[PDB]
Amino acid sequence: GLFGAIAGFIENGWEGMIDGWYGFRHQNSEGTGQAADLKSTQAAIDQINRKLNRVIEKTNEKFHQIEKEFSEVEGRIQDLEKYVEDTKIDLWSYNAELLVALENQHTIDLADSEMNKLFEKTRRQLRENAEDMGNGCFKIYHKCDNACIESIRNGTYDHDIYRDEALNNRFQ
Amino acid sequence: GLFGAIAGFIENGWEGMIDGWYGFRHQNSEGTGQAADLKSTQAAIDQINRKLNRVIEKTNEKFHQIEKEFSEVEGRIQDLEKYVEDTKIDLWSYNAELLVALENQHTIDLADSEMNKLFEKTRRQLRENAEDMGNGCFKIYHKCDNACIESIRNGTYDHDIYRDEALNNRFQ
Amino acid sequence: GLFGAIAGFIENGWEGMIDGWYGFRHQNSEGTGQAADLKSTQAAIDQINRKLNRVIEKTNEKFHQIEKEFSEVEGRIQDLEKYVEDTKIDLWSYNAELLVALENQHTIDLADSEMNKLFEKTRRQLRENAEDMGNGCFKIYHKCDNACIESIRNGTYDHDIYRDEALNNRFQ
Amino acid sequence: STATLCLGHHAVPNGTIVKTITDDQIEVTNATELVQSSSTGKICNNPHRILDGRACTLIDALLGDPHCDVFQNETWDLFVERSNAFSNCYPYDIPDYASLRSLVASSGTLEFITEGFTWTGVTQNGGSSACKRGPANGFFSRLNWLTKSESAYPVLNVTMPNNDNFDKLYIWGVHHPSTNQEQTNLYVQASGRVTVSTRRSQQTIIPNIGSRPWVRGQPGRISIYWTIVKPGDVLVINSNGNLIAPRGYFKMRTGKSSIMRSDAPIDTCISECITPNGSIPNDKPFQNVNKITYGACPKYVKQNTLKLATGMRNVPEK
Amino acid sequence: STATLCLGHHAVPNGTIVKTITDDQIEVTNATELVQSSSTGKICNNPHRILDGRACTLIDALLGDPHCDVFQNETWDLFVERSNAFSNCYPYDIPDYASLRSLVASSGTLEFITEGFTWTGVTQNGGSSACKRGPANGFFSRLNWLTKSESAYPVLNVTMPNNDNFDKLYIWGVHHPSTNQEQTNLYVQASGRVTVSTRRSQQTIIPNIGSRPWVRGQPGRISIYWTIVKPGDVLVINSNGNLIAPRGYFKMRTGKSSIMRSDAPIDTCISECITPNGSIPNDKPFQNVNKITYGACPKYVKQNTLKLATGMRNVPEK
Amino acid sequence: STATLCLGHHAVPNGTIVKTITDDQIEVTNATELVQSSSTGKICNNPHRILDGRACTLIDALLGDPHCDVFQNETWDLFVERSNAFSNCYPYDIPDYASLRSLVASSGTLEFITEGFTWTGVTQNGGSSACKRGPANGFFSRLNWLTKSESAYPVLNVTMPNNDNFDKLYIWGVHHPSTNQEQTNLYVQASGRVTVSTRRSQQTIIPNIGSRPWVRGQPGRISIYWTIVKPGDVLVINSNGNLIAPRGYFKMRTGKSSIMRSDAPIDTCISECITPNGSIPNDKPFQNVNKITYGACPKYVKQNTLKLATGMRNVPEK
Numbered sequence A, B, C: 001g002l003f004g005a006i007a008g009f010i011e012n013g014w015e016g017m018i019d020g021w022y023g024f025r026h027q028n029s030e031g032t033g034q035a036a037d038l039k040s041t042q043a044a045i046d047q048i049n050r051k052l053n054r055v056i057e058k059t060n061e062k063f064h065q066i067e068k069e070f071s072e073v074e075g076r077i078q079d080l081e082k083y084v085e086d087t088k089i090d091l092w093s094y095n096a097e098l099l100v101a102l103e104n105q106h107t108i109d110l111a112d113s114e115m116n117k118l119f120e121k122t123r124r125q126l127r128e129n130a131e132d133m134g135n136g137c138f139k140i141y142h143k144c145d146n147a148c149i150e151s152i153r154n155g156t157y158d159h160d161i162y163r164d165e166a167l168n169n170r171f172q
Numbered sequence D, E, F: 001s002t003a004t005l006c007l008g009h010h011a012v013p014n015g016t017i018v019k020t021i022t023d024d025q026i027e028v029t030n031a032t033e034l035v036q037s038s039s040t041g042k043i044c045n046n047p048h049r050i051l052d053g054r055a056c057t058l059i060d061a062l063l064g065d066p067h068c069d070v071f072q073n074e075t076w077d078l079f080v081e082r083s084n085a086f087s088n089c090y091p092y093d094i095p096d097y098a099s100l101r102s103l104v105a106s107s108g109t110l111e112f113i114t115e116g117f118t119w120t121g122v123t124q125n126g127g128s129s130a131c132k133r134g135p136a137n138g139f140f141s142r143l144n145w146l147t148k149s150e151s152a153y154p155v156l157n158v159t160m161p162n163n164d165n166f167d168k169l170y171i172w173g174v175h176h177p178s179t180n181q182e183q184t185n186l187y188v189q190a191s192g193r194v195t196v197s198t199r200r201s202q203q204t205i206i207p208n209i210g211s212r213p214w215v216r217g218q219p220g221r222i223s224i225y226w227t228i229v230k231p232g233d234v235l236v237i238n239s240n241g242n243l244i245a246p247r248g249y250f251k252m253r254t255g256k257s258s259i260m261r262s263d264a265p266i267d268t269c270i271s272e273c274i275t276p277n278g279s280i281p282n283d284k285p286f287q288n289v290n291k292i293t294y295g296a297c298p299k300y301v302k303q304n305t306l307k308l309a310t311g312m313r314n315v316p317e318k
């Protein structure tokens, strides 16, 4: 993926996560936990769903056309009828092949981007209280109980409240 | 957008910035201001312009072709003549639909990539003298006057000059 | 490129680099050196090679088809036969034009992304022991001899061993 | 003292392989099929007015082959010709058969309007044992086999104006005797001639005497032709022998009617898209059932499967 | 002590709606139209040599219908046939009209060169009341109606070599009398015959006698045929009745010449692309005007509007 | 005290120019060519069975023009017609020549099976000085020019059954005398006739008399027709004059056989793709050599060079 999050600096996925696409996992004084990020997950899902709908609800009508199977040999005219249909068929087959190729490649990069967005959204929240360990995990340099972590996930985390405590641990 | 800058970690755009696609707004001892980044803006425009020019400076000459409207009923031959045209038409309509769809998606992500590039460019200039507040803003931890702010925008800023002052304010 | 690494925050290229697409160059108490990052380089090469193969090992067979050159003037039927082949030809010429366009645009961003990945992979390794100077170079705030640099390149760098020494230099 | 917060994404037990620009094989957590590749095997009797030929070709129905009289004036959105259909009337031959089958199929109607004959001097309703109509010798319902009357075949010259506001489809023919004796015996003149014209067209056919393989006992044949008379124009049939007269005309309408060759059973259901393999759902963008299709249908493509990714890349865990 | 510098992008009041891969409806600051959907309603008199058929069809112009003699030796990059064009000469039929109208159109020239054929034994320059060239009777300017002379009509046999370095297009025809009395009266022989051949093509037509609807008073029809004689070859016309002789040939050229059916006025302007609805600009990739085009033209597409985004996404402030 | 580590990417002295979505000209470190622009100039001898017509067109080989006798019963995956091929037999003309050339080319076999035809009452093996077979007057090998015998020409009526499981391609024709004297002199009847029918079709053709340009000394000409007889059908040939009799049938087959017009030498190599300009590599997606192809071949497109990027962007180095 272009963003190197998924199948990148984040070793692997979580099969235990079944209620979300992206989420957090901690290990604080109170033990360890796991919660899915609805906001993030929905954003990916909403985009991929639109992507899908631009390709499914659509087909055109064609009634009276040209024959495409023949019981007798005829020559010139028939050759043209077959060439035309065959030419048509390859052009569309090409289009289909290229559509999924492009779409999929973009779908993989998008999901990867959304993961990275969450990581960045988190890093910025934590400010100077945490450090990126390089594996998708942040080392919060201050006692952070379940409540403290929850505020992070729900985005209400107040970095000042812990800055001092944190700065001391970081630079001592 | 893949980069999450525009319509992302930057809450909204400025209708006031009428001199560019990108810029800075600042609040310092001397006041509050707003310049537009030329270098950045010009780079977005040059790319979208080349992107546009590839799509519109091209047409193909076709003189004597087949007929396409008939005054009487004929059968086999005429059916083929219509299928052919109808077939051709659907395939270009598909090409057109796809062309913009692809193009527009890359166009929105490019403008996002350009915004982000200016941000990382800016963050790398400030070094340790400032912090990313997460709303698209850097809290510069020293007294950065209109001259200091100009040195940052035109890219001349020397992090060494305000380093000490900043660290004092940061880790206190 | 969308990532602003190559032909962006990294001024130039290294024509001296002959063993890889990406790599490190240092300066330390012992002197300067240069080494290519195999992991990084191979990742780009492997991707681009797959990208290429999706487009080369493929062609379909067509035997008996329609005539396409004529020695005499005939009219209606021949017109159709020409219109058909001409229509076919433009559609494919367009596909070829768009494929490389798309492919090439995506190939340039991918190579750029892979360069950015290596930078991030390095920044995260160094933690609080270095600072991004803004030109693709990191200023490591601690005596780092050939061995120390090598551990970084092979990814075994232990940031704790130098954290104290570094923190002192950084904030003094 | 310190805490650790890790960001991640999910993965699934068994993922799905998909193709991208840099992989012909890469696994993602979820995907959806874009190629409709299966059929129920039956043709839904509707949105489309469907008509089963059963044993009658659209042509035989048009001509009026006895066992096909049940189709008289039938209409259809889609005519379905069966492979076991057969002809059991008088041996015929149609120059440009394909075209006629096409323009009628497209018209979607067999509405026949009998018009005032005007055959003075000849014997009408000729018939053949090759076209048995019950116990008797019959002939195509819509055609009138003319023969000599009282040792003479007049120089026929009838006119039929098109005073309506729609085009009329006249379908007539000319008969090819098996021998000269038959020729003179049936039409007196040693050489027949049929000329059907309008102010816009004119086609003159000449009979041709000779022996041909027996078909239901007949060595002779009938070549069939047609003429469209536009409003304001008029039809003129001029012949001194061998003419197989029209009995009226067929109304010609334009629409979405068409024809298809298929042995698929016509069940009771609802399916927008019809193929010779049966009906198929049109929720997918592409289909691999058959290139022949009628209605709102996905485009046909060679590929039997195309997966559109619908989830991130699936990365397991050791 | 502190300073605060925020980075941002702009936005605009009335943004623009565009379509993407992940949105069929999303707003950007600016975009440009790619589908030329409009007209001027008129065809520009330049760059292409345009010729208004007016009341004359390219065919009648070729044959030489009296009111079409102004078109003699005319040329055109684009011939323009009008909907109110009429034929004011002798009833004619052309098996394969469409192909003749076509090859002639593509040659884009009506240059006729009169040849010295010598019709010994017959009466020439014959005419009709249905060919009032001026008040008196007449005929197609490029054709020569041949009739008996001094109670006879020779087995005509005339040769005409192609000693030039180019291809000649000869257009001749045969006459179909309304009755036998007419046949024997005009051509003596009871059955006519026309044979035109080269060392490469041979075509022989047989007159067919009958009554056909009156057109400008004539039941009879003339069927028209053509013959291309290549360099180094020779034309041979053999007939003993019913031949409508050639008077020479048409020079055949290759180029970008063509024909179009329209009613669009022809103004004085400059438009590279021409359509039945009039000329239209070619600065946009696509167009929704008419699929019929001539010149450097945007591909026709069903979509009536396609916007190419030319600016970032538009995220206003409230 | 401190160390300095820099990250970077390579670059090349002279790079390669490519086209993107935002640059019709940008430079990369390495690219590969997507369009095959060059041909060897020669046609490989073999994944395909190649047959060089040499001085014979496929037709003349089919008919049996004396010098085309070597191609007797020959087969081919691809027949190669040369620009300098010629005909040295009797002057002929084939209505729908193209279709015959096409169906035989597609069949890819000239296996002529001779049947036992029953021509009672006439003189067989007719010939001319226009088709010398050595010093003597000859005719096409697969044809039988019939003429009068003992002062009469029988009303021929011959039947020939297809009691095989495959289709038979019968190729016959009718002769066009130059004058009436010749007509009666050769066939006795003033007017000839050929009727070749099956239970599925019929083609009743009438001789045409008149003078045509001397070809190899002959005013007259032979028109040529064909007939397919399906397993379970029988061929009936009924003619009282001017018939050019079949001598048997050609066995029809389906495959990948075809025909191409090219002057390109035939060489001993191995190449899947064949163009009139020679054989060419099929390792590239596209080609700009010739739109005419055969075998595993690149889609022809108008562009002569198409570069696929295979390296990052090239940025110099100071």
Ligand SMILES: *[C@@H]1O[C@H](CO)[C@@H](O[C@@H]2O[C@H](CO)[C@@H](O[C@@H]3O[C@H](CO)[C@@H](O)[C@H](O[C@H]4O[C@H](CO)[C@@H](O)[C@H](O)[C@@H]4O)[C@@H]3O)[C@H](O)[C@H]2NC(C)=O)[C@H](O)[C@H]1NC(C)=O
Residues within 6 Å of the ligand: D211, D212, D213, D214, F157, F158, F159, F234, F236
């Ligand atoms: C020109 O050649 C054709 C083809 O060879 C030829 O046509 C043949 O004509 C004969 C008779 O004229 C046909 O023979 C009939 O064959 C069918 C079998 O399918 C029988 O039903 C017929 O019945 C006879 O025998 C019955 C005994 O049960 C009797 O009940 C009945 O009364 C008859 O005696 C009869 O045998 C034959 O079908 C065709 N063949 C083809 C290929 O069409 C034609 O005669 C020749 N031209 C001329 C007029 O000389």
Ligand SMILES: *[C@@H]1O[C@H](CO)[C@@H](O[C@@H]2O[C@H](CO)[C@@H](O[C@@H]3O[C@H](CO)[C@@H](O)[C@H](O[C@H]4O[C@H](CO)[C@@H](O)[C@H](O)[C@@H]4O)[C@@H]3O)[C@H](O)[C@H]2NC(C)=O)[C@H](O)[C@H]1NC(C)=O
Residues within 6 Å of the ligand: D157, D158, D159, D234, D236, E211, E212, E213, E214
């Ligand atoms: C086969 O049938 C056709 C169709 O009916 C037939 O053609 C018809 O011939 C008659 C003449 O016999 C045509 O009648 C003419 O009608 C037009 C009307 O526009 C008039 O111009 C003609 O005028 C005559 O009568 C006038 C009366 O005052 C005179 O002033 C004038 O001088 C004329 O004498 C004439 O009435 C009729 O138009 C055609 N019908 C069509 C549609 O073709 C044909 O003759 C029949 N075959 C034969 C010859 O038996």
Ligand SMILES: *[C@@H]1O[C@H](CO)[C@@H](O[C@@H]2O[C@H](CO)[C@@H](O[C@@H]3O[C@H](CO)[C@@H](O)[C@H](O[C@H]4O[C@H](CO)[C@@H](O)[C@H](O)[C@@H]4O)[C@@H]3O)[C@H](O)[C@H]2NC(C)=O)[C@H](O)[C@H]1NC(C)=O
Residues within 6 Å of the ligand: E157, E158, E159, E234, E236, F179, F211, F212, F213, F214, F215
């Ligand atoms: C209808 O018109 C055609 C075309 O004009 C006409 O055909 C011509 O017939 C004459 C013969 O009657 C052909 O002339 C021959 O030309 C070749 C040229 O290669 C000569 O070799 C022939 O030589 C004969 O005559 C010689 C006298 O000089 C003798 O020495 C010699 O032994 C031969 O007998 C001869 O000159 C002429 O080529 C054709 N023209 C074409 C193009 O066909 C035909 O005669 C006319 N129809 C009728 C029945 O009148």
Ligand SMILES: CC(=O)N[C@H]1[C@H]([C@H](O)[C@H](O)CO)O[C@@](OC[C@H]2O[C@@H](O)[C@H](O)[C@@H](O)[C@H]2O)(C(=O)O)C[C@@H]1O
Residues within 6 Å of the ligand: D126, D127, D128, D129, D130, D137, D145, D146, D147, D176, D177, D178, D182, D186, D218, D220, D221
């Ligand atoms: C209109 C008419 O005359 N119908 C005849 C029919 C036609 O003459 C025939 O189709 C012309 O091709 O002929 C019918 O007969 C076959 C019958 O003919 C006798 O003459 C003979 O003696 C019998 O052996 C037998 O061949 C027919 O059914 O086609 C009778 C019909 O009345």
Ligand SMILES: CC(=O)N[C@H]1[C@H]([C@H](O)[C@H](O)CO)O[C@@](OC[C@H]2O[C@@H](O)[C@H](O)[C@@H](O)[C@H]2O)(C(=O)O)C[C@@H]1O
Residues within 6 Å of the ligand: F126, F127, F128, F129, F130, F137, F145, F147, F177, F178, F182, F186, F218, F219, F220, F221
């Ligand atoms: C089957 C047959 O009759 N073969 C003839 C042939 C044909 O009559 C001719 O091809 C018909 O077009 O004619 C041949 O000679 C032509 C020759 O005949 C003379 O008698 C006459 O004096 C010459 O002018 C000339 O017409 C031929 O070789 O074609 C002879 C052959 O036996």
Ligand SMILES: *[C@@H]1O[C@H](CO)[C@@H](O[C@@H]2O[C@H](CO)[C@@H](O)[C@H](O)[C@H]2NC(C)=O)[C@H](O)[C@H]1NC(C)=O
Residues within 6 Å of the ligand: D072, D073, D110, D111, D112, D113, D114, D251
């Ligand atoms: C449809 O077909 C019927 C035949 O089934 C037509 O009915 C005939 O109408 C004529 C008068 O025009 C009567 O003289 C016949 O007796 C009717 N046929 C019989 C006996 O059923 C009807 O006119 C046709 N009309 C349509 C719907 O096109």
Ligand SMILES: *[C@@H]1O[C@H](CO)[C@@H](O[C@@H]2O[C@H](CO)[C@@H](O)[C@H](O)[C@H]2NC(C)=O)[C@H](O)[C@H]1NC(C)=O
Residues within 6 Å of the ligand: D037, D038, D039, D276, D277, D288, D289, D290
């Ligand atoms: C759908 O029906 C067709 C018949 O029209 C099936 O038959 C295939 O026909 C093609 C002709 O283009 C042949 O090349 C194949 O050999 C036929 N397939 C087989 C194995 O019978 C076709 O297979 C049917 N497809 C489906 C989805 O059942």
Ligand SMILES: *[C@@H]1O[C@H](CO)[C@@H](O)[C@H](O)[C@H]1NC(C)=O
Residues within 6 Å of the ligand: A146, A147, A148, A150, A151, A152, A154, A155, A156
């Ligand atoms: C965020 O978490 C904190 C601590 O658990 C809680 O008090 C606060 O209400 C949460 N905010 C929301 C609305 O999720």
Ligand SMILES: *[C@@H]1O[C@H](CO)[C@@H](O)[C@H](O)[C@H]1NC(C)=O
Residues within 6 Å of the ligand: B146, B147, B148, B150, B151, B152, B154, B156
């Ligand atoms: C940047 O701004 C400072 C103060 O305005 C000025 O002195 C300096 O020259 C500027 N640098 C450039 C090249 O714009």
Ligand SMILES: *[C@@H]1O[C@H](CO)[C@@H](O)[C@H](O)[C@H]1NC(C)=O
Residues within 6 Å of the ligand: C146, C147, C148, C150, C151, C152, C154, C155, C156
């Ligand atoms: C990394 O470098 C260190 C010091 O030079 C060395 O001891 C170690 O083995 C290296 N690791 C690898 C896998 O190259």
Ligand SMILES: *[C@@H]1O[C@H](CO)[C@@H](O)[C@H](O)[C@H]1NC(C)=O
Residues within 6 Å of the ligand: A049, A052, D030, D031, D032, D310
């Ligand atoms: C895959 O996505 C589709 C729609 O995008 C959804 O209907 C389907 O349930 C998903 N796969 C599963 C079974 O989770």
Ligand SMILES: *[C@@H]1O[C@H](CO)[C@@H](O)[C@H](O)[C@H]1NC(C)=O
Residues within 6 Å of the ligand: E015, E016, E017, E029, E030, E031, E032, E307
């Ligand atoms: C920019 O955006 C608006 C909406 O697409 C558009 O109508 C306008 O034409 C564009 N600007 C121009 C004139 O190119």
Ligand SMILES: *[C@@H]1O[C@H](CO)[C@@H](O)[C@H](O)[C@H]1NC(C)=O
Residues within 6 Å of the ligand: E072, E073, E111, E112, E113, E251
């Ligand atoms: C028609 O043009 C030709 C030149 O191609 C010329 O010889 C002939 O005299 C012209 N006829 C008229 C009507 O000018």
Ligand SMILES: *[C@@H]1O[C@H](CO)[C@@H](O)[C@H](O)[C@H]1NC(C)=O
Residues within 6 Å of the ligand: E037, E039, E276, E277, E288, E289, E290
């Ligand atoms: C253009 O002309 C066609 C007829 O050829 C007409 O039906 C159509 O509505 C016209 N549309 C435009 C672009 O005005």
Ligand SMILES: *[C@@H]1O[C@H](CO)[C@@H](O)[C@H](O)[C@H]1NC(C)=O
Residues within 6 Å of the ligand: C052, F030, F031, F032, F310
């Ligand atoms: C590009 O040049 C390289 C040199 O490293 C070569 O290996 C490669 O084959 C060329 N590109 C391709 C994919 O053909």
Ligand SMILES: *[C@@H]1O[C@H](CO)[C@@H](O)[C@H](O)[C@H]1NC(C)=O
Residues within 6 Å of the ligand: F072, F073, F111, F112, F113, F114
């Ligand atoms: C091909 O011609 C030969 C004589 O050269 C003949 O015996 C053979 O039957 C013909 N081909 C076949 C096998 O049908």
